[PDB]
Subunit: 211 residues, 3 copies
């Protein structure tokens, strides 16, 4: 459920979705929220402060303790079957963040498309750190306390090591990324949710990654 | 504290304090042991499964620990150890042991497991099995230190603020820091009290020299 | 506030807000000054000992600071500096200073002390004595930055998110980030307002270029 103030906000949250202990605050005009079926979005605080903002959460998404701040003309899209523990998402500068299907974001994530303040080059006075969209691909696992900064695109089927800060995009899927700066530390892997399988062949969710 | 199951044994001696702490035990044939003169406050401790062993020796002070133990796991914290806020997770039937007279600053994360599997595409095998963590006697973890699976810390070691350990170390009496974690100083001993000018003023340090 | 001891002085301007902030001073000869138009809110500030100094100039905004000062220590924060949630600890009779118009994001941990001694086996002597921290003018600390003892930060520097500083830098007008912390960008100046087109549009930045 939610607290909505302004003109022509559209909030459509499926009746099959649970929103226990969550604060959804929409302050402004022409904002739109869609939450799909069989979601569990609990103990969160989602704030849309501005105009023309979009939040889209697909089916079967489970979120616990997300603190999310969206400003005018920004967009957050989270695709189906993604799960997220406690963390923070911040979108400004009329930008966007997208998180793919069947991602797994462990406690302590911080994801942002913006530094929130300008840096200028002394060579010409011009701003050099404009906001840039973040794209997290399908089936990405962010370990604990991962930080994803502006402009970063993460390929499909990637694991990001605990405590890693990503400043730059990667192109290689099926790898583990860790260190500073962040780099590929292992290639040719696939991760899964349940650790009771002899091999990957026992997890029917993984077939697409190896077939 | 909250118990659902049979043949669970819980001995929390008095002389020891558990103010504002939640203990939940779901399962059977589990054992919780907290020694004398311990301080276990504002913590949330969960045991779920069977034949789990939680052992906290005498003279232990823990404030704000979140601890999760799964079936057939064991956590052992030896005497004199002090701990601030942090997290310990044990799974995959493994164990974590923390030696005597350790000093763990706020922010610690200790676990023997990733909680999820990573397989090789090359042979389909899981490659990140859980492994025991052994933290030696008289270890100081600075703020926000992360100790991951399979790591063994020698006796009398300082780990620098915000360091993450992925690998074991063999050298005692050292300071460890950086990324990757590295020995950055050798032949030291730490103590708890700044007012002790020299290691000779601190009777607790006799054994390390 | 709560104050115990003799010759303790506490001057908090009438024009400053201290909502939800607890201030505790225990000892003798301690001095607290908070200047005009400050907002020092939801903070926990403790002075315990003798001859301690807390100086916070005009137009400083602080939210969620946990600050601990021991005997003969001093903390000085100059005008127009803003600080989110964080921790500052000063012991061993040392000093921390934060210059004018700094911007510290939530999560800072700043200390001049390790709080616990490390001794050399060779001679039994303590070898991690506390050292003073100096953060220059117009320093921006990104989220969750840690500044350890002895560190001096030059004027007009940005420190990147989750960076740990364990040693001093001398280059101004740069961005420092990574582990180990290093200069990753030179010849810059940061400002507060994303709405501005260029550095020239922000009159507070005039003193840093030309
Ligand atoms: C209950 C409690 O446990 C409360 S205590 C928590 C509050 N205190 C802390 O977390 C302690 C903060 N201090 C530190 O982490 C210190 O680095 C510790 C671990 C205490 C060690 O201090 P010291 O023995 O004084 O050595 P320190 O100068 O820090 O570093 C030794 C070398 O290791 C380097 N180093 C330190 N941190 C580094 C890093 N992060 N990356 C790379 N190098 C690093 C230093 O630059 C130095 O190099 P050199 O001088 O030999 O060329
Ligand atoms: C203070 C307040 O009141 C509120 S602020 C709190 C919210 N905002 C934040 O925490 C800011 C988050 N942003 C950052 O940390 C950014 O990195 C900052 C520090 C702002 C810098 O932004 P920019 O000037 O755009 O730097 P950027 O180009 O991304 O720097 C990348 C360069 O420096 C490297 N780099 C950046 N961070 C790095 C890192 N951690 N490790 C290694 N390299 C790093 C990049 O790989 C790249 O190198 P190259 O391309 O020159 O070879």
């Amino acid at each position: 459920m939610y607290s909505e103030q302004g003109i022509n906000n559209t909030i459509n949250i499926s009746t099959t979705s649970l929103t226990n202990a969550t604060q959804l605050t929409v302050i402004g005009n022409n904002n739109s929220v869609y939450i799909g079926n069989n979601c569990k979005i609990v103990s969160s605080n989602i704030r849309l402060k501005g105009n023309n903002i979009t939040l889209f959460i697909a089916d079967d998404v489970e979120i616990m303790g997300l603190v999310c701040s969206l400003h005018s003309d920004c967009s957050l899209q989270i695709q189906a079957k993604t799960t997220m523990g406690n963390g923070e998402i911040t979108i400004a500068e009329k930008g966007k963040i997208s998180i793919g299907k069947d991602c797994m974001l462990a406690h302590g994530y911080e994801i942002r498309n913006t530094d929130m303040h300008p840096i200028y080059s002394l060579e010409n006075g011009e701003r050099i750190n404009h906001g840039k969209d973040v794209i997290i691909g399908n089936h990405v696992w962010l370990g604990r306390n991962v930080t994803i900064l502006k402009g970063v695109c993460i390929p499909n089927n990637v694991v990001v090591g605990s405590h890693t800060v990503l400043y730059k995009s990667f192109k290689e899927p099926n790898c583990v990324i860790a260190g500073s700066p962040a780099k590929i530390v292992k290639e040719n892997i696939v991760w899964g949710r349940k650790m009771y399988h002899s091999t990957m062949y026992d997890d029917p969710t993984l077939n697409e990654f190896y077939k």
